[PDB]
Write an enzyme that holds these catalytic residues in place. Structure first.
Site, PDB file in Angstrom:
ATOM      1  N   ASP A  67      -4.733  -7.015   1.435  1.00  0.00           N
ATOM      2  CA  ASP A  67      -4.918  -5.591   1.252  1.00  0.00           C
ATOM      3  C   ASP A  67      -6.129  -5.018   1.954  1.00  0.00           C
ATOM      4  OD1 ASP A  67      -3.898  -3.226  -0.077  1.00  0.00           O
ATOM      5  OD2 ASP A  67      -5.214  -3.564  -1.737  1.00  0.00           O
TER       6      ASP A  67
HETATM    7  C1  LIG Z   1      11.438   2.658  -6.406  1.00  0.00           C
HETATM    8  C2  LIG Z   1      10.317   2.237  -5.477  1.00  0.00           C
HETATM    9  C3  LIG Z   1       9.790   3.464  -4.633  1.00  0.00           C
HETATM   10  C4  LIG Z   1       8.406   3.229  -3.933  1.00  0.00           C
HETATM   11  C5  LIG Z   1       7.128   3.622  -4.718  1.00  0.00           C
HETATM   12  N1  LIG Z   1       6.030   2.769  -4.282  1.00  0.00           N
HETATM   13  C6  LIG Z   1       4.813   2.792  -4.817  1.00  0.00           C
HETATM   14  O1  LIG Z   1       4.487   3.558  -5.726  1.00  0.00           O
HETATM   15  C7  LIG Z   1       3.839   1.727  -4.253  1.00  0.00           C
HETATM   16  C8  LIG Z   1       4.008   0.434  -5.027  1.00  0.00           C
HETATM   17  N2  LIG Z   1       2.434   2.072  -4.239  1.00  0.00           N
HETATM   18  C9  LIG Z   1       1.646   1.674  -3.254  1.00  0.00           C
HETATM   19  O2  LIG Z   1       2.089   1.126  -2.242  1.00  0.00           O
HETATM   20  C10 LIG Z   1       0.180   2.103  -3.369  1.00  0.00           C
HETATM   21  C11 LIG Z   1      -0.062   3.370  -2.501  1.00  0.00           C
HETATM   22  C12 LIG Z   1       0.814   4.578  -2.772  1.00  0.00           C
HETATM   23  C13 LIG Z   1       2.131   4.558  -1.981  1.00  0.00           C
HETATM   24  O3  LIG Z   1       2.096   4.272  -0.770  1.00  0.00           O
HETATM   25  O4  LIG Z   1       3.218   4.824  -2.559  1.00  0.00           O
HETATM   26  N3  LIG Z   1      -0.811   1.082  -3.018  1.00  0.00           N
HETATM   27  C14 LIG Z   1      -1.900   0.844  -3.750  1.00  0.00           C
HETATM   28  O5  LIG Z   1      -2.180   1.491  -4.762  1.00  0.00           O
HETATM   29  C15 LIG Z   1      -2.897  -0.212  -3.197  1.00  0.00           C
HETATM   30  C16 LIG Z   1      -2.998  -1.547  -3.994  1.00  0.00           C
HETATM   31  C17 LIG Z   1      -1.735  -2.016  -4.603  1.00  0.00           C
HETATM   32  C18 LIG Z   1      -1.002  -3.038  -4.009  1.00  0.00           C
HETATM   33  C19 LIG Z   1       0.240  -3.469  -4.567  1.00  0.00           C
HETATM   34  C20 LIG Z   1       0.728  -2.860  -5.722  1.00  0.00           C
HETATM   35  C21 LIG Z   1      -0.014  -1.836  -6.321  1.00  0.00           C
HETATM   36  C22 LIG Z   1      -1.244  -1.425  -5.758  1.00  0.00           C
HETATM   37  N4  LIG Z   1      -4.216   0.428  -3.256  1.00  0.00           N
HETATM   38  C23 LIG Z   1      -4.574   1.436  -2.482  1.00  0.00           C
HETATM   39  C24 LIG Z   1      -5.970   1.994  -2.726  1.00  0.00           C
HETATM   40  C25 LIG Z   1      -6.401   2.992  -1.624  1.00  0.00           C
HETATM   41  C26 LIG Z   1      -7.865   3.505  -1.730  1.00  0.00           C
HETATM   42  C27 LIG Z   1      -8.249   4.456  -0.597  1.00  0.00           C
HETATM   43  C28 LIG Z   1      -8.079   4.188  -3.068  1.00  0.00           C
HETATM   44  N5  LIG Z   1      -7.025   1.023  -2.944  1.00  0.00           N
HETATM   45  C29 LIG Z   1      -7.373   0.655  -4.164  1.00  0.00           C
HETATM   46  O6  LIG Z   1      -6.715   0.997  -5.139  1.00  0.00           O
HETATM   47  C30 LIG Z   1      -8.564  -0.332  -4.265  1.00  0.00           C
HETATM   48  N6  LIG Z   1      -9.803   0.339  -4.663  1.00  0.00           N
HETATM   49  C31 LIG Z   1     -10.956   0.218  -3.986  1.00  0.00           C
HETATM   50  O7  LIG Z   1     -11.069  -0.491  -2.968  1.00  0.00           O
HETATM   51  C32 LIG Z   1     -12.202   0.951  -4.578  1.00  0.00           C
HETATM   52  N7  LIG Z   1     -13.331  -0.023  -4.688  1.00  0.00           N
HETATM   53  C33 LIG Z   1     -12.653   2.146  -3.729  1.00  0.00           C
HETATM   54  C34 LIG Z   1     -11.677   3.370  -3.653  1.00  0.00           C
HETATM   55  C35 LIG Z   1     -11.969   4.546  -4.650  1.00  0.00           C
HETATM   56  N8  LIG Z   1     -12.700   5.680  -4.069  1.00  0.00           N
HETATM   57  C36 LIG Z   1     -12.211   6.504  -3.138  1.00  0.00           C
HETATM   58  N9  LIG Z   1     -10.978   6.325  -2.696  1.00  0.00           N
HETATM   59  N10 LIG Z   1     -12.993   7.427  -2.559  1.00  0.00           N
HETATM   60  C37 LIG Z   1      -8.287  -1.602  -5.223  1.00  0.00           C
HETATM   61  C38 LIG Z   1      -6.952  -2.277  -4.901  1.00  0.00           C
HETATM   62  C39 LIG Z   1      -9.399  -2.659  -5.062  1.00  0.00           C
HETATM   63  C40 LIG Z   1       7.322   3.335  -6.216  1.00  0.00           C
HETATM   64  N11 LIG Z   1       7.402   2.125  -6.545  1.00  0.00           N
HETATM   65  O8  LIG Z   1       7.360   4.286  -7.050  1.00  0.00           O
END
Ligand SMILES: CCCC[C@H](NC(=O)[C@H](C)NC(=O)[C@H](CCC(=O)O)NC(=O)[C@H](Cc1ccccc1)NC[C@H](CC(C)C)NC(=O)[C@@H](NC(=O)[C@@H](N)CCCNC(N)=[NH2+])C(C)C)C(N)=O
EC number: 3.4.23.-
Lengths: 124, 124
Positions: free
Chosen positions: B37
Site C-alpha cells: 500500500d
Molecule cells: C462492491 C464493491 C465496490 C467497490 C468499493 N470499493 C471500496 O470501497 C474499496 C475497498 N476502498 C478502497 O479501495 C479504499 C479507497 C477508496 C476507493 O478507492 O474506493 N482504500 C483505502 O482506504 C486504503 C487502504 C485499504 C486497503 C484495502 C482495504 C481497505 C483499505 N487507504 C487509503 C488511504 C489514503 C490516504 C490519503 C488517507 N490511506 C490510509 O487510510 C492510511 N492512512 C495513513 O497513511 C495516515 N497515517 C495519513 C493519512 C490521513 N491524513 C490525510 N489524508 N491528510 C492507512 C492505511 C495507514 C466497495 N467495496 O464499496
C-alpha cells in the site's frame, strides 16, 4: 514514471482534469495534487477539489469504505480527461474516466488509473 | 518483487511474522496475508491476525485516519521480523519493526517497510 518509495515522502503527483461534457461549466480544466494509491481500487477526487458545477450521479454502491469505515460516494456524470505531470515536467499518457467524488482528505489515483499508466510496483 | 498494477486483483503478498522478544509466546511465527500500500505510511497488522498475546503499547497518537474517520492503534512491544514470501516461496529481505496494531479490514504493508524492500513505482 519512476518514483522510489520513501516512507517520508508520499507518492504525490501533479494532475490536470478536464470536463469534456457537451454542456457548459465555468472552468473546463483544473489543477490538483494526487497521491498514487495501490490499496485504492478506485480513483476518487475529494469534494473540496471537485467543481460545484461538474454534474454527478449515483455510483452503483452508495459508499466507499476504508479505515474509519464507509464514506458516501457519488460519480462523475461527464467523462473527465485525467492527465499526469511527472515531477520533472514531462506528461504521462492521457486517460479518460468517470471519477468517484467524496469527502476524501486527499485526491487519490487508484489501481484503475495506475494500471492505465502502465505501473508495476517493483524492487527489481 | 515486481507487481504489475491491475485494478482487477490486489497487490497482495503472504507474509511471515516472528516475535523476536525474550519472552514466552504461544506461537512465535504466524502466516498472514497483506496488501502492498503506497497510500499508507505505516504498516498495520489487523487485530484479527495479531496473536493477541504479543504485547502492545498504545504508543504515539492513536493514528489510523483514512477515508472513514479515525481508529485507535497500539504498537508492538517486541521487535517483529517480517518476511515477504513472493509467488514461489522465495522470500524477499527480512525486515524488523514494531508494526502498529488496529482493527484494520486488512494487513497493510505501508511505505516504511515498503521502502525497506526497495519498492518504487515505474512504467519504464
Ligand atoms: C462492491 C464493491 C465496490 C467497490 C468499493 N470499493 C471500496 O470501497 C474499496 C475497498 N476502498 C478502497 O479501495 C479504499 C479507497 C477508496 C476507493 O478507492 O474506493 N482504500 C483505502 O482506504 C486504503 C487502504 C485499504 C486497503 C484495502 C482495504 C481497505 C483499505 N487507504 C487509503 C488511504 C489514503 C490516504 C490519503 C488517507 N490511506 C490510509 O487510510 C492510511 N492512512 C495513513 O497513511 C495516515 N497515517 C495519513 C493519512 C490521513 N491524513 C490525510 N489524508 N491528510 C492507512 C492505511 C495507514 C466497495 N467495496 O464499496
Amino acid at each position: 514514471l519512476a518514483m522510489t518509495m520513501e516512507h517520508k515522502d508520499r507518492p504525490l503527483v501533479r494532475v490536470i482534469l478536464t470536463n469534456t461534457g457537451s454542456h457548459p461549466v465555468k472552468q473546463r480544466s483544473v489543477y490538483i495534487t494526487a497521491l498514487l494509491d495501490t490499496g485504492a481500487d478506485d480513483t476518487v477526487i475529494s469534494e473540496e477539489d471537485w467543481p460545484t458545477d461538474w454534474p454527478v450521479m449515483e455510483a452503483a454502491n452508495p459508499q466507499i469504505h476504508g479505515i474509519g469505515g464507509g464514506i458516501p460516494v457519488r460519480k462523475s456524470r461527464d467523462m473527465i480527461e485525467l492527465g499526469v505531470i511527472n515531477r520533472d515536467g514531462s506528461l504521462e499518457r492521457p486517460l479518460l474516466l468517470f471519477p468517484l467524488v467524496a469527502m476524501t482528505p486527499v485526491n487519490i489515483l487508484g489501481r484503475d488509473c495506475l494500471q492505465g499508466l502502465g505501473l508495476r510496483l517493483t524492487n527489481l
